[PDB]
Design a protein around this ligand. Structure first.
Ligand SMILES: O=P(O)(O)C(O)(C[n+]1cccc(-c2ccccc2)c1)P(=O)(O)O
Ligand SMILES: O=P(O)(O)C(O)(C[n+]1cccc(-c2ccccc2)c1)P(=O)(O)O
Ligand SMILES: C=C(C)CCOP(=O)(O)OP(=O)(O)O
Ligand SMILES: C=C(C)CCOP(=O)(O)OP(=O)(O)O
Ligand SMILES: [Ca+2]
Ligand SMILES: [Ca+2]
Ligand SMILES: [Ca+2]
Ligand SMILES: [Ca+2]
Ligand SMILES: [Ca+2]
Ligand SMILES: [Ca+2]
Ligand code: NA
Ligand code: NA
Lengths: 362, 362
């Protein structure tokens, strides 16, 4: 990938800075520095880098479209990589905390961070907070004299909030919302009345689309000084459509992609998650199959899980996804065509992001 | 207190804004809005408000000093309250996450947030993230047109990082640091070689002094436009001295203050924490008593815990604390006197903060 080499070089630079700043400011010892390096590498590396690389792709596209000398181009590219790593570290933060919340086993082909024997959830919760803090530290340091510092902080923290609210929707989606009460425990739903297209869309848009699609695009624009050269409303809309689709893919793969290929072991079925599969099944399946689903969903029993996967196969959920996907490509291409009519350089960078998204296998 | 009524009014105002903003931006439903209101109230209220009210005390003192007119004074007081709630919500965030990490039972006289039957740690981890996000949201909204917004965000996030590094020191202090290895579990120490004055000071300065003492003081100066009026190094120094002492008090009270007065049930002894008591005991006790300590510390057995408390009592730990406190008083008074020679108004505000700290009972 065009910017992969540059992006990994900036990782090493940012890591050296962050760990060195801790030695300088917080009397960091050699052993905990080593721990923190291992934590950063394990939690921030090993993914696809779709988010981080997008920032760099967008920034370059927009910078090429402007007039600027070699030194200015180098600055935009370096700043873009730093911004990319801010988002990768925000991702790292979310996944550390998510893996604890989901009581998960594997992430990116390795044991989850909290599941490392020398860590535990008791330490990893705070390791996640360190990751989040580091992301802002990168902006404060590298962008100390840049005009876009304030706007970078604003959009980053807005998206942080947005994602935590999406996560709220996610973690509270298996209990009937009328029953949600801090003082009283409640069993998970038995009737699944709230497992609706609207409720699934609300979960995925806020928990995924903002930080995975909207944030990288906007940061690319901010570091290149071109945010005002694009249609804000249109950019948001295409980010939501692609981001919803990206999470739908994630939902589908939880059931249908081998964990060894995926690098993670999803338990959506065991945890009675309001996934795209669950919602699509419940709203399309015949009455007796809906009943059987309800009898078997949200159980850790392997036979119950196997019944759900077979019911999904019988209801042709993979084919139904392909129909959804066809509808999504149609909309995305239209939205991109509209963006292209306004700013062809930006629209090209949206195409690049979409191309890494469409029909992905992990 | 002078600003308690104003401060509580601003709470109601910021709460309405934050919940309203979620409705506007994230399609927040009535049930989850109610959940979030109860979460905010439970996690943000019921403390002493020393941090938040300090911001207002400092801002008022400096606004009077610089002869602000009625309209300017009202703005600074309202801004100060908002900054105060940023810190209270940062505190709320830390305590939510800490109660999970320490597996605690009570906070501020009520069950810990995660222990509310309708919550659990698996929801509460994210509730803590929401609180942290909300703190930045207040600044972005209320200070959108203020030139001090940049510096408020900078200091807030620097202190957030500092505190998480302090927390790293805290949670990794019961294992030999040379044995800190993500891939390998290691038992708690048996020799306690790292339970040193230096390591205790490092934990408490970073986990407590920055967010409890330095941050409220700096924010009061930032909102009143008076940071340039005071000695930065001297301010930092007095904040470190008071903050260390404040955490030493917290450590002492874990053992010697009844949970019902304190409002929380500490388990420093059961969890083999590197507390001021443990460190001071180990470095001053005769060898026979040190051996007894090692044979009983870090045990959940109530008799073992009682043995430790008896050892502390026999070693005159409370008297030793009183002697430390005398030395702190002497240093704080010297530092305040030097501040007073430079800016009397700010020195008075530090005196107010110190008066709420010195010989506190909870
Ligand atoms: O558990 P999910 O939801 O299926 C997953 O996609 C992670 N994820 C996605 C979006 C948001 C969050 C999230 C955001 C904030 C806080 C916690 C989690 C996690 P996974 O299949 O990769 O585990
Ligand atoms: O557990 P501690 O350390 O004794 C306590 O004082 C809370 N606290 C203090 C400082 C920092 C943090 C903290 C900061 C960041 C993350 C987690 C915890 C918690 P408690 O007696 O009130 O529980
Ligand atoms: C589905 C979401 C939003 C979480 C995983 O995101 P990715 O699939 O982008 O994970 P990495 O590439 O970062 O491993
Ligand atoms: C000792 C620390 C730093 C944690 C508790 O802080 P406080 O004792 O200030 O708690 P509240 O008043 O906020 O309850
Ligand atoms: Ca997960
Ligand atoms: Ca999850
Ligand atoms: Ca998933
Ligand atoms: Ca605690
Ligand atoms: Ca603790
Ligand atoms: Ca304590
Ligand atoms: Na499964
Ligand atoms: Na105890």
């Amino acid at each position: 990938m065009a910017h992969m080499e540059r992006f990994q070089k900036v990782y090493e630079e940012v890591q050296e800075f962050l760990l060195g700043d801790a030695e300088k400011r917080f009397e960091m010892d050699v052993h905990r520095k080593g721990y923190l390096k291992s934590m950063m590498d394990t939690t921030c590396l090993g993914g696809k880098y779709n988010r981080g690389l997008c920032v760099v792709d967008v920034a370059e596209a927009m910078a090429k479209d402007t007039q600027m000398d070699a030194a200015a181009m180098e600055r935009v590219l370096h700043d873009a990589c730093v911004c990319g790593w801010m988002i990768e570290m925000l991702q790292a933060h979310f996944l550390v905390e998510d893996d604890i919340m989901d009581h998960s086993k594997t992430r990116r082909g390795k044991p989850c961070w909290y599941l490392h024997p020398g860590v535990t959830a008791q330490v990893a919760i705070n390791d996640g907070l360190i990751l989040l803090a580091w992301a802002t530290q990168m902006a404060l340091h590298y962008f100390a004299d840049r005009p876009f510092l304030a706007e970078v902080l604003r959009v980053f923290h807005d998206v942080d909030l947005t994602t935590t609210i999406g996560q709220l929707y996610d973690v509270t989606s298996m209990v009937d919302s009328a029953k949600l009460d801090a003082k009283v425990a409640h069993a998970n739903t038995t009737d699944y009345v709230e497992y609706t297209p609207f409720n699934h869309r609300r979960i995925v848009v806020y928990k995924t689309a903002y930080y995975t699609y909207w944030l990288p695009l906007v940061m690319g624009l901010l570091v290149s000084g071109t945010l005002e050269k694009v249609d804000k409303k249109a950019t948001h809309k295409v980010a939501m459509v692609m981001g919803e689709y990206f999470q739908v893919q994630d939902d589908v793969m939880d059931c249908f992609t081998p964990p060894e290929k995926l690098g993670k072991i999803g338990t959506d079925i065991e945890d009675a998650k309001c996934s795209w599969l669950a919602v699509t099944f419940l709203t399309t399946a015949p009455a007796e199959k809906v009943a059987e689903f309800k009898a078997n969903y949200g159980s850790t029993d392997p036979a119950a899980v196997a019944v759900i996967k077979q019911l999904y196969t019988e209801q042709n959920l993979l084919a139904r996804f392909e129909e959804y996907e066809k509808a999504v490509v149609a909309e995305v291409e239209q939205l991109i065509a509209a963006l292209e009519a306004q700013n062809a350089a930006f629209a090209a960078s949206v195409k690049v992001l979409w191309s890494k998204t469409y029909k992905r296998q992990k």
